[PDB]
Amino acid sequence: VYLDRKLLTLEDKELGSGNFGTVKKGYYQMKKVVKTVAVKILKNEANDPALKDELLAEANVMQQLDNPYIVRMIGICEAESWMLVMEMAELGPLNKYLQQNRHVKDKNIIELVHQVSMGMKYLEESNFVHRDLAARNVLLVTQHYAKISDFGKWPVKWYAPECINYYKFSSKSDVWSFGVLMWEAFSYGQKPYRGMKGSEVTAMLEKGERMGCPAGCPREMYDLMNLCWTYDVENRPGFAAVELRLRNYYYDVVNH
Ligand SMILES: Cc1ccc(NC(=O)c2cccc(C(F)(F)F)c2)cc1-c1cc2cnc(Nc3ccccc3)nc2n(C)c1=O
């Protein structure tokens, strides 16, 4: 639950930078072995007791969410600053990985997005709405093991129309984001709606227009992105339906 700072070694290089924290790679001593971890060090400049409350609440939320397809919590550590200790996904975000590894097979991409649907089906079942599902928020443990993470101005290009218009956030608006995620993945981490303003994307979507099928993307997978992009929220699938369609496809295509 609560970790001993003496058992925690921090590297001075930053994996992430933010207004309320700095992420650093570390090592947590465990009897015989040492476990590589990612550490959010609370930056409370600031200087409120509610910021610490938020970190402790996130820790409680994370404790409840236990699934192999989400960045899992190791524990909390109170030292020079408050620290949240998480497992390390050594390859970093899915977008950057794919921009540098054009050799990734489309069979390997089906497996990754299915794993993302599995973790999102879990979050849906636990009544948890992500709100920032994108490729940059999918971190790789290995090339065959994806984990969902969550690191004013909004990520409009991943937003469902009911989020832009009425601020209605649900698991079904996370489904829309999943479809933008799938597009980013088969496009080898290229930016969705490249060079468009958020306002331009809203207008395009209202004309019934959607992003084209990436090069080499299987047709069944593009058909699924399009169903994730259903304008009417009531007709849009949930993650139970999405995961089941990806599971079947993985069972058919990837078995070997
Ligand atoms: C350090 C850290 C603290 C907290 C979180 N939070 C979550 O993952 C989270 C919070 C709420 C909901 C959910 C959801 F349930 F939806 F999943 C997740 C994440 C981190 C954290 C972990 C992490 C793991 N690996 C890497 N790898 C990496 C490698 C190369 C370059 C960049 C990153 N990075 C991580 N980072 C940056 C983290 O912040």
Pairing type for strands 92-93 and 82-87 reads unpaired
Token pair in block for residue 80: 């020079």
Q: What technique was this entry resolved by?
A: X-ray
The closest of 195, 225, 228 to 213, measured between CA atoms, is: 225
The closest of 130, 106, 108 to 119, measured between CA atoms, is: 130
The structure was resolved to a resolution in Å of 2.3
Spacing, Cα 143 to ligand 1 middle (Å): 17
| Whether residue 70 has its Cβ less than 6 Å from ligand 1 | yes
What is the location of CATH 1.10.510.10 in the chain? Answer: 89-256
174 labelled catalytic: no
In sequence order, what E strands does the chain have? 8-18, 21-30, 33-42, 73-78, 82-87, 92-93, 138-142, 145-148
| Whether residue 224 has its Cβ less than 6 Å from ligand 1 | no
CATH assignment of 89-256, among 1.20.1050.10, 1.10.510.10, 3.40.50.300, 3.40.190.10: 1.10.510.10
What is the location of CATH 3.30.200.20 in the chain? Answer: 1-88
What atom in ligand 1 is closest to the CA of residue 96?
31
Q: Which helix (H) or strand (E) holds 7?
A: none
What CA–CA distance (Å, rounded) separates 127 from 144?
27
Q: Tell me which fold the domain 1-88 belongs to.
A: Phosphorylase Kinase; domain 1 (3.30.200)
